[PDB]
Design a protein around this ligand. Structure first.
Ligand code: MYA
Ligand code: PS8
Length: 411
């Protein structure tokens, strides 16, 4: 039994989810007028805070909370170390609602103890294609197509309770209050990902890794030398040789994205994403924001030939604190962001991703098996990890789909 999630407009079981045929809301339809205007009650030693995201010092406080209390691997070897410039980038996209950033502070000292954030996103989340088929088959098309239009919803992320406050039922309260602030602005759906199993995922994809610096990865125990490498004189030599990469990209035509590129990238990106059942729709401003290069944060390259952007790829940076080594403070990880290829094979576009990432000193390239990410796994030498990233909707009945039907990257 889930004493909190049992009370919420989400499907409660797998056998419920594997049964839903059409997209649509779970809940009673409500109105902003229905929604309490007062923040949810919390204990008197605490207060609600709305951090200002254009203030270095609020940003810093959130940074400090996540640096010390955000996601850890299960072995307590690594913890995410999202930088401050990263957090402002992710929390302040175009038309962000400050009010959707929810913080709990100790009244006395104003020590930050909990956080959750929401950001707007325009998401295509109607009935998946295979299920539109079975609908036509059955004369049920109009019902299946009812919620096809892109919805302006909320993207939830960065939920985090201080280590000292764990298992005190605080996280439900943060979620109820975030829900409140979002329902207040006439939004009734949310989307979120988590490494854990909650009721109830609509897709689930394995994690994948590609060693850029195998010596460090073994030293910090991110990676092991596989038994098959012992049959060699010099295990680390063979490993290193095995993952080596060219020093410069292979595609002539390749450079960083510039502002003048935005409409072409938007265009090639949307054509690509539109073939997925679940995926975002981006304005010019959203493409500028989520893809223009920003130092230490997001790195984006286009293939231009004949003054035409035929292809682009993007990645972003999240260091993890190495918790249990002493020699290395940090794992320097590149995450495959969005991309599109029209003129060249995808494995060929992404090789140049590895090449750049490695040349800029990243230790590893990470990804989930969404988009067409599966298409380059073997030839670029990615390995599956032990994670599962799960994708969820709040207040939205949706069929179980394959992770390769998802085109939403969550930071
Ligand atoms: C319309 C808009 C709607 C807006 C809202 C949309 C929904 C958003 C939903 C959230 C999307 C966030 C996506 C991300 O950011 S995922 C990243 C999550 N963050 C971390 O893992 C950081 C390290 N961990 C922690 O800070 C805490 O352990 C957290 C905060 C995760 C739980 O704190 P704590 O350990 O002190 O526990 P509790 O006693 O306070 O609370 C216990 C209840 O919490 C349920 N629980 C445990 N983990 C998660 C989890 N990751 N998502 C949702 N629920 C979770 C759990 O099943 C139990 O419920 P029930 O089993 O009793 O029913
Ligand atoms: C190096 C390292 N550092 N950390 C902190 C870990 C867990 C690893 N090892 S890992 O590489 O193998 C790995 C990686 Cl990168 C990531 C995730 C993961 C979990 C949750 C999540 N959501 C993303 C959206 N917001 C909510 C959280 N995304 C990703 C799990 C694994 Cl297990």
């Amino acid at each position: 039994a889930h004493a909190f999630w049992s009370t919420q407009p989400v499907p409660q079981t797998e056998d419920e989810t594997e049964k839903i045929v059409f997209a649509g809301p779970m809940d009673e339809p409500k109105t902003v007028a229905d929604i309490p205007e007062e923040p949810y009650p919390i204990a008197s030693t605490f207060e609600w805070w709305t951090p200002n995201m254009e203030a270095a010092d609020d940003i810093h406080a959130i940074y400090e909370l996540l640096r010390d209390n955000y996601v850890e691997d299960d072995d307590s070897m690594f913890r995410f170390n999202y930088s401050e410039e990263f957090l402002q980038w992710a929390l302040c996209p175009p038309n962000y609602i400050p009010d959707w950033h929810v913080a709990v502070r100790r009244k006395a000292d104003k020590k930050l103890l909990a956080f959750i954030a929401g950001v707007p996103v325009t998401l295509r989340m109607g009935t998946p294609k295979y299920m539109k088929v079975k609908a036509q088959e059955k004369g049920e098309g109009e019902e299946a197509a009812k919620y096809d239009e892109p919805r302006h919803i909320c993207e939830i992320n960065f939920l985090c309770v201080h280590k000292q406050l764990r298992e005190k039922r605080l996280a439900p309260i943060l979620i109820k209050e975030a829900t409140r602030r979002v329902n207040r602005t006439n939004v009734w759906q949310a989307v979120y990902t988590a490494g854990v199993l909650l009721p109830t995922p609509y897709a689930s994809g394995q994690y994948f890794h590609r060693s850029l610096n195998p010596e460090k990865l073994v030293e910090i125990r991110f990676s092991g030398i596989p038994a098959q490498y012992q049959k060699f004189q010099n295990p680390m030599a063979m490993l290193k040789r095995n993952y080596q990469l060219p020093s410069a990209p292979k595609n002539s035509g390749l450079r960083e994205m510039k502002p003048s590129d935005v409409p072409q990238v938007r265009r090639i990106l949307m054509n690509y994403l539109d073939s997925f059942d679940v995926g975002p729709v981006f304005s010019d401003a959203e493409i500028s924001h989520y893809l223009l290069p920003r130092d230490g944060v997001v790195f984006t390259y286009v293939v231009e030939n004949d003054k035409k952007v035929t292809d682009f790829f993007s990645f972003y940076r999240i260091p993890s604190t190495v918790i249990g080594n002493s020699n290395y403070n940090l794992l320097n990880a590149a995450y495959v962001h969005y991309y599109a290829a029209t003129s060249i094979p995808l494995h060929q576009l992404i090789l140049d991703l590895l090449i750049v990432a490695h040349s800029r000193g990243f230790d590893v390239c990470n990804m989930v098996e969404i988009l067409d990410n599966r298409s380059f796994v073997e030839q670029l030498k990615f390995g599956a990890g032990d994670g599962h990233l799960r994708y969820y909707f709040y207040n939205w009945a949706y069929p179980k789909i394959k992770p390769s039907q998802v085109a939403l990257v969550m930071l």
